[PDB]
Design a binder for these strands. Sequence first.
RNA 1: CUGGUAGUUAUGGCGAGAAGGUCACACCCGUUCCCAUACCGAACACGGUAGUUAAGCUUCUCUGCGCCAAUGGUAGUUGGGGGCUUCCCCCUGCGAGAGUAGGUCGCUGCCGGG
RNA 2: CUGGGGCGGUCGCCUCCUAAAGAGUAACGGAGGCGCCCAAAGGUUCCCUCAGAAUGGAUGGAAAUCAUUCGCAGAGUGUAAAGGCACAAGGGAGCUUGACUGCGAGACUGACAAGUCGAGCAGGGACGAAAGUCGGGCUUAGUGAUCCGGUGGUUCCGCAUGGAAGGGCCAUCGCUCAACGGAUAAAAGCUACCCCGGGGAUAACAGGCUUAUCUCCCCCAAGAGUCCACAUCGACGGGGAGGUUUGGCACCUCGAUGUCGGCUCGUCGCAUCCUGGGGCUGUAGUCGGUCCCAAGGGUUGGGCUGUUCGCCCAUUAAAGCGGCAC
RNA 3: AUAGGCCCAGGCGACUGUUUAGCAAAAACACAGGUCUCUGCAAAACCGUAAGGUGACGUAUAGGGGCUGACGCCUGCCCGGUGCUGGAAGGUUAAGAGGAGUGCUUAGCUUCGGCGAAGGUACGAAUUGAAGCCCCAGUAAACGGCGGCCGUAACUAUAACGGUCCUAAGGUAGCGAAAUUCCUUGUCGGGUAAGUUCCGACCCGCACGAAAGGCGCAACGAUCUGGGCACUGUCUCAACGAGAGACUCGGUGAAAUUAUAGUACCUGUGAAGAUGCAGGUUACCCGCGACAGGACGGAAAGACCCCGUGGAGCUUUACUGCAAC
RNA 4: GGGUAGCGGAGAAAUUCCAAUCGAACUUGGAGAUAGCUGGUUCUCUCCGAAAUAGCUUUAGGGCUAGCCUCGAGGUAAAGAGUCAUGGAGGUAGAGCACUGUUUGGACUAGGGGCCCUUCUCGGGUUACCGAAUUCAGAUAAACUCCGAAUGCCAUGUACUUAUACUCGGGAGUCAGACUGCGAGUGAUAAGAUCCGUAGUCGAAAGGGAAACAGCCCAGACCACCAGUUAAGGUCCCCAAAUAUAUGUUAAGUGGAAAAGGAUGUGGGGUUGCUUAGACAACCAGGAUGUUGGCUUAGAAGCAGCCACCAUUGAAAGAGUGCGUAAUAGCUCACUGGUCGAGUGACCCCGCGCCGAAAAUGUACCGGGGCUAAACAUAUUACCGAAACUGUGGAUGAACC
Lengths: 73, 414, 133
Amino acid sequence: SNGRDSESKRLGAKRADGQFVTGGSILYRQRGTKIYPGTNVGRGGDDTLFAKTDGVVRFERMGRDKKKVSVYP
Amino acid sequence: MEKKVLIVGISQKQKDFDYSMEELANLAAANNMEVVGEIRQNIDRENRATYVGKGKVDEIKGLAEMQDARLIIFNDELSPSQIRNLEEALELDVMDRTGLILAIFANRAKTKEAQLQVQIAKLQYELPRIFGQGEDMDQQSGKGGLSNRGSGEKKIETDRRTIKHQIRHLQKELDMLVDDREVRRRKRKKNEIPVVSLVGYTNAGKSTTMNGLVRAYSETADKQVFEKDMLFATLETSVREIVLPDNKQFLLTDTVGFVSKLPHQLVKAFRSTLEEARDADLLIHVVDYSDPHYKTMMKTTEETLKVVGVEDVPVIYAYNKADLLEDEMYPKQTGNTIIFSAREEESLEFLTEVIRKELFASYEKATFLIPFEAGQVVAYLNEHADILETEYLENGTQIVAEVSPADLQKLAEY
Amino acid sequence: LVPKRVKYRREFRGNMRGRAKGGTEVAFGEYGLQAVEASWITNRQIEAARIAMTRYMKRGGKVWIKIFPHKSYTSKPIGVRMGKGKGAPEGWVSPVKRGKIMFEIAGVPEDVAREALRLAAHKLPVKTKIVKR
RNA sequence: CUGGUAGUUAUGGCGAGAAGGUCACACCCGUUCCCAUACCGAACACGGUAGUUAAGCUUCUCUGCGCCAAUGGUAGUUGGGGGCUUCCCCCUGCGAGAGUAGGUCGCUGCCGGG
RNA sequence: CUGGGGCGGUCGCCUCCUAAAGAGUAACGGAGGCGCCCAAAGGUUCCCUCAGAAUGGAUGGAAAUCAUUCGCAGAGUGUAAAGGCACAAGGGAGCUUGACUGCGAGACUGACAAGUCGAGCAGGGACGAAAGUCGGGCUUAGUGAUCCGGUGGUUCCGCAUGGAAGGGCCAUCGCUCAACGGAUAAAAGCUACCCCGGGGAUAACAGGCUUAUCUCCCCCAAGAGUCCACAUCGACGGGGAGGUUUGGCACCUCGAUGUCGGCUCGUCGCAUCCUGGGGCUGUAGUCGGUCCCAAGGGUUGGGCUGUUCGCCCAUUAAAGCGGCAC
RNA sequence: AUAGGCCCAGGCGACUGUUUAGCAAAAACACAGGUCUCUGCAAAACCGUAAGGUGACGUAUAGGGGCUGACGCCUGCCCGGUGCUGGAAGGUUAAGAGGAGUGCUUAGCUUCGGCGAAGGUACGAAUUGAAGCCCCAGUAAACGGCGGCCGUAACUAUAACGGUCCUAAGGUAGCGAAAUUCCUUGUCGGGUAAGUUCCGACCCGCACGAAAGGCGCAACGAUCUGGGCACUGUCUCAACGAGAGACUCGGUGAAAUUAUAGUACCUGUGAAGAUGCAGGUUACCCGCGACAGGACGGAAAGACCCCGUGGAGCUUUACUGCAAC
RNA sequence: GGGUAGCGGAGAAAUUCCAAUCGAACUUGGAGAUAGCUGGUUCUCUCCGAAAUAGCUUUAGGGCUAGCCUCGAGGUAAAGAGUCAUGGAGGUAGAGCACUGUUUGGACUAGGGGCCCUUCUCGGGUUACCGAAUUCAGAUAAACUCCGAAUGCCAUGUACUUAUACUCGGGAGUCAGACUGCGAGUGAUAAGAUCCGUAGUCGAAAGGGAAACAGCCCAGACCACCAGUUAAGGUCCCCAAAUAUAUGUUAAGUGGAAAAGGAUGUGGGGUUGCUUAGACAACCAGGAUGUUGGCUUAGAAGCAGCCACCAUUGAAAGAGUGCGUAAUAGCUCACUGGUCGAGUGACCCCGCGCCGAAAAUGUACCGGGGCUAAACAUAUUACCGAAACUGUGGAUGAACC
Ligand SMILES: Nc1nc2c(ncn2[C@@H]2O[C@H](COP(=O)(O)OP(=O)(O)NP(=O)(O)O)[C@@H](O)[C@H]2O)c(=O)[nH]1
Ligand SMILES: [K+]
Ligand SMILES: [Mg+2]
Ligand SMILES: [Mg+2]
Ligand SMILES: [Mg+2]
Ligand SMILES: [Mg+2]
Ligand SMILES: [Mg+2]
Ligand SMILES: [Mg+2]
Ligand SMILES: [Mg+2]
Ligand SMILES: [Mg+2]
Ligand SMILES: [Mg+2]
Ligand SMILES: [Mg+2]
Ligand SMILES: [Mg+2]
Ligand SMILES: [Mg+2]
Ligand SMILES: [Mg+2]
Ligand SMILES: [Mg+2]
Ligand SMILES: [Mg+2]
Ligand SMILES: [Mg+2]
Ligand SMILES: [Mg+2]
Ligand SMILES: [Mg+2]
Ligand SMILES: [Mg+2]
Ligand SMILES: [Mg+2]
Ligand SMILES: [Mg+2]
Ligand SMILES: [Mg+2]
Ligand SMILES: [Mg+2]
Ligand SMILES: [Mg+2]
Ligand SMILES: [Mg+2]
Ligand SMILES: [Mg+2]
Ligand SMILES: [Mg+2]
Ligand SMILES: [Mg+2]
Ligand SMILES: [Mg+2]
Ligand SMILES: [Mg+2]
Ligand SMILES: [Mg+2]
Ligand SMILES: [Mg+2]
Ligand SMILES: [Mg+2]
Ligand SMILES: [Mg+2]
Ligand SMILES: [Mg+2]
Ligand SMILES: [Mg+2]
Ligand SMILES: [Mg+2]
Ligand SMILES: [Mg+2]
Ligand SMILES: [Mg+2]
Ligand SMILES: [Mg+2]
Ligand SMILES: [Mg+2]
Ligand SMILES: [Mg+2]
Ligand SMILES: [Mg+2]
Ligand SMILES: [Mg+2]
Ligand SMILES: [Mg+2]
Ligand SMILES: [Mg+2]
Ligand SMILES: [Mg+2]
Ligand SMILES: [Mg+2]
Ligand SMILES: [Mg+2]
Ligand SMILES: [Mg+2]
Ligand SMILES: [Mg+2]
Ligand SMILES: [Mg+2]
Ligand SMILES: [Mg+2]
């Protein structure tokens, strides 16, 4: 009566902290905001975080319990 | 939370069918199952396909959903097919009276000898109900009727080597454990000590009568048998030395109880327990007089005893639980008939007297003259005979008593 | 001893590596029966050991059962090939890791405690040590 | 000195106690006008400043709650070896969680009034 | 597909655990969902905070609504589960249709087919004072290709030419094709009358591993045994040995390891049925019981059952239990 | 020398016949008899594309087909379903007939836009159009099917009689542990020292069951089952003798099989069962007569089992077809 | 002598017969049918060298694309590999109880149900019969998390080593895997089981060791050598090397299978009571008196059983430690002076051993012999030991001068 399961959705980080990315590069795939959009980063309709401009990826803390990813040129 | 069951009965011209149903309900309480429904159908001969008429099989299925009963209990032992036909028709689990008793024993049973007896029953009961399933199993999906070297049959020994071989092992094991009883009997038998065996219906009060006579008339009165208001409280024979205040000595033995429509497989096991009763010098049949169906209980008991092999044994029909009635007096006798209350001491003091009339008849009065030099013989008479008077002379001691013929050979010189 | 209900009817056997994380010091009674090596203690073994302790004390003093059988285990009947999904739940076990005080007793003298616990220990599939507070 | 407005994982929070007030801030008085209530000038909005530090507000004290937190030891563990292999032990590196010593009633920037 | 095959179950998609702190990861492993819904349950502006408990109050009851205090979420979030969410992604109200057209640097995911995210540009809008947000919904299921048909549109083609027929292109609709990458528009059984090609890749026999089960031996000792745990037994539990059972596995053999019982012939083990020696005994004696040593020899004629086995008759000192391809 | 063994009791089949050449001789087939049905003569049925035939040089007391199977006693209830037969003339449906209209085209007419006769052409509505099916009746020795519940039955009827519910109708007569019986080696008796077989009473099929016949039944059987007498090397338990072979000699002289072989045993090991590997233990070289434990001996690319988008034969309310009607 | 012929005949019916063929005859042809199946496929050396996986598949022992091999070519801040440093994502091990579930024992009140009840069980008084909260203490988790490693992963560097990487083409094979270690599932925390992950070896690897023994330990064979050094494993003999050195242990052939449990084995520690003003063992007296303590009982007189268990003489003796008696008598202990002249008695921990320990052809659970070390522990050093590495000579591929 079991035997079922969906395809795995290859979620999680797609570029590293300190890595140069082009504009539009997906940084993080996630359900909801495990990580929040930082500066020069946007949240897609499925919570995908992406670089709005070229630059270096930086994962920072944004207040005790939360976390964010920025892109600094 | 005791589960919900439903009980089904069929009067095959049975004398008191009403009781047999009440009893089966009492049994269902004992196994810890809550009787929600009572289905009675009054046919002459039972339907060899579905025990009940195929019409009722729907009338049950209807009441089993309205009351929400997980399984249904049938007052007679059901044939294998008789069961399968109901399993399908009802869509519910089914348990006949035999399987319901076999469950109660299996719980109640706390000695190896007992556990094996009941394992042998359950297996002998179930073996058939698996046979028809074990033969039907893989007749559809088989090895194309075995045109091969494999050899042997999947028809026979699928069951007969799974069950029936272990029934042979379990009987061989039970025989070994009942041959060990002859070695425990050995000393009593050799000492020719008279045995007063209690029988009767469950709850009759016989394990209580025993406890009574052990309080009053045992050198070690620390040891009482298990007594409780449940069906089949006792399942293993006890033997207790009873020494009367006069110094007469017998053994009092308390057995398994009986109950109407006792499975013909359990009956084979019982024979081993009632081994002491069949070899008894006296037989005390205890009936619950307070209950309405006591003439019904008593006859059902005797019919069982005949099957067990209790023949030509002096019987005493003690009627018990007199206190529950207001009309009847406590201690009374009318030949084999004796009315008494197992709770009360006066009752026992009276039952004791009735035993002393049946066993120690050969005990007669005799005079002895024992010199002072052989005091040991005075002690023997103080311990193994009832002294009426104790006279003292200058030459020796002169003592007149009730002694046995065995003592009238030993003390003959006196 | 049985969980009144369970989130999941079937459950991994798990493992018994390491010293028990808690319940390694007698905390309620005077004397305790400490597991020296790891083992599954079934509920049938806990009951056996409990009655054996209790009968010998004669309704005297207290008995704490410090382990509870939280974990079901399943079995396959004889004559059933492997596969066709996990077998039906059979019973209940407490995975006892080494150093876990399984029973504790107070309100009887040392000798009776020490005797009660050796009778209990003989019903358990694990090497035991009697320890006091 | 106080109003505004930021930054900083609560060492910043909560709770308790106390003091202060046209220099703002506040409550407070009113519903004529703009504007309000799925009813209500409570709120929102607008017009006042008689009244008051009582509350919020600001400053000061406190470790009751939280929060932060070593060292040491232990668990675990990469790699390398052993056993008596439900598991256990040794060597090398890394090293928690809990608990404890202790820390904390914030720190930092700009702008206006004083 | 399948711990042989059949029967049963399953077949596509989503969430979790298994999954070993990136991603991925199997089993007829453990749990649940889906084949939609919503004109607002979508967009935007503005405003807001839930559950529960305590306490007091008419019908009012434990629990309706009202008021106060305490309440980081113990609520809610259309719908499983996970990840999120109180600057709310949760709750109100006003206006709306961005549930827009053309696209799209660049990424993720993927054998392919497909799938996913996307700043930004243009057209023309919604809301907003503006900033700005808006290419459906907190996120992740709600689907199905091609071929062939149908309808709508069209500065495309139109078989000499003008048309037309018909085709193309754009948009959209019609099969549980669900065995869900869909053999066809259209598909059930028996074979013991069978045949060919193959396989020890895979079952039935025997062997092997395993030893749950089985047999035997033990530990503890509540009980039984006339008193009496241990003469003889021994529950609840616990620990082993053996490899005769019931099983598990599929490792040798399918270019054949060809058969149950009986007959003939035995041989071996000892966990001993008899006979020999001994300890204990509930060993007075007789007749027994039990354990230790002991494998030298011995260990049956019939009736019934195909029957191993069993039951029975009649014997015997005894009518042992196992192994050796049962 | 050559010439029946017999008897008692069952099952099945009436009987004599027939059959799987070469593993089945039977209880199977046939049979006389029975019944159903078709068939009016260029008969039906059958073979053949047809002609021509068989049927039959027959003619309903005859011919074909189905089922049953001498004889005796019997063969119950059900026509709702399926088939068959008949009826009725509504509904639906084909080709064919019919041709209202509508596209396309164009001689013109064009107020720009569009209209547009005639002819041609592509379609085409109503109406018309049979059998079958749908509907109604019959028919069971057609295919088939033949229940419950509640009381009184004092008995006794396993299955009556009286109420009810449902059904097309509720399994009648007879028979019943059977060539049929799961509980079951059913229970009691007989027969035996001992009887799961056998025979006979009770209980028993959820009712086995009446022409895929039910129940009887003399005669018959290389039929099956049980018992008895005779008789015996069947056996207790084997002995002796004869011939043929075997063996020796002379003559003649194959075969299957075969990687090469100087080819022990034990215990182990190993693709998990070793003459050949290890460690041991035994063992002088070559033959002859014998015996079969092993060489997983020989024989036959396993018949079982699975697999193969391999066959073949058979079935049907699988799909698609075809003859025939 | 004739007739019926294979999409057919014939059949007292069996799938029965139709030329030793019949569920559809024989023969020739279509025809070299087709065969995702089995078998087979022939000279040599050199260089490299897999896979047994994913996805989809009327697919599962077939195939296709990808992955992994090879050949060629290209470009190429070398983009690959390792380590260091730095940054980061991520919730496993462990742990924890803040949440969710599972759970033990107190304490605390609500209540209801037992229990009594002037009562309408409206209200009291009790409860340990349940009870839902509540706190205190204590547990537990694959699908709990206030926490949280080691590793692994992604990056960056102006770091040090190393030598691959990528792109495009030509050619493949593979899609049965096996075992071992570690982490999981399924199973019984069985399997030489099954299914993943991860590493290795086998596969496709010869050599040495493990008696023999694909998958274990050591280690990679280009060829030759009657050279050398080492690895695992060894050094009494088979059999090359120690009858090696030092200090201990074991008596079981333990070593050279096997547990619960059992025990006066033996070595070492560590606490501790008595002790030359005499212990402990034995031997020499004494071991009395009230008194047969009372009750109980026929009898119970230390000693069936119940209840008390005081004093006394001094050296001290229980209202008695075992036997004994019918009860008595009798023998014995405890408990004391005497003799004798050194140790003696409890408890805990560790090492190594013992029992528990029965299978089938033959010793048969060290390969054998045999071993009391030739066993074990700790420490040491020599040697033997491979096709490893080195030496010498030779052959050969690639790259670079
Ligand atoms: N009032 C009353 N109760 C009695 C009497 N005798 C017995 N009982 C009760 O009935 C119960 C049942 O009797 P009991 O002796 O235990 O059962 P039994 O007769 O041994 N039957 P079994 O052993 O088969 O169970 C007793 O436990 C006791 O409570 C009596 O004379 N009067
Ligand atoms: K134990
Ligand atoms: Mg997955
Ligand atoms: Mg969306
Ligand atoms: Mg009783
Ligand atoms: Mg299967
Ligand atoms: Mg299998
Ligand atoms: Mg992961
Ligand atoms: Mg044209
Ligand atoms: Mg598919
Ligand atoms: Mg047949
Ligand atoms: Mg074949
Ligand atoms: Mg195999
Ligand atoms: Mg396979
Ligand atoms: Mg097998
Ligand atoms: Mg074999
Ligand atoms: Mg396998
Ligand atoms: Mg062969
Ligand atoms: Mg022996
Ligand atoms: Mg026989
Ligand atoms: Mg055999
Ligand atoms: Mg005949
Ligand atoms: Mg023949
Ligand atoms: Mg024949
Ligand atoms: Mg004609
Ligand atoms: Mg017939
Ligand atoms: Mg006829
Ligand atoms: Mg008609
Ligand atoms: Mg008989
Ligand atoms: Mg026979
Ligand atoms: Mg009829
Ligand atoms: Mg008929
Ligand atoms: Mg007939
Ligand atoms: Mg004949
Ligand atoms: Mg010759
Ligand atoms: Mg050899
Ligand atoms: Mg021969
Ligand atoms: Mg052969
Ligand atoms: Mg073959
Ligand atoms: Mg046939
Ligand atoms: Mg022929
Ligand atoms: Mg061709
Ligand atoms: Mg060919
Ligand atoms: Mg190479
Ligand atoms: Mg953990
Ligand atoms: Mg976890
Ligand atoms: Mg394997
Ligand atoms: Mg692995
Ligand atoms: Mg290979
Ligand atoms: Mg090798
Ligand atoms: Mg070797
Ligand atoms: Mg090889
Ligand atoms: Mg050297
Ligand atoms: Mg040497
Ligand atoms: Mg080399």
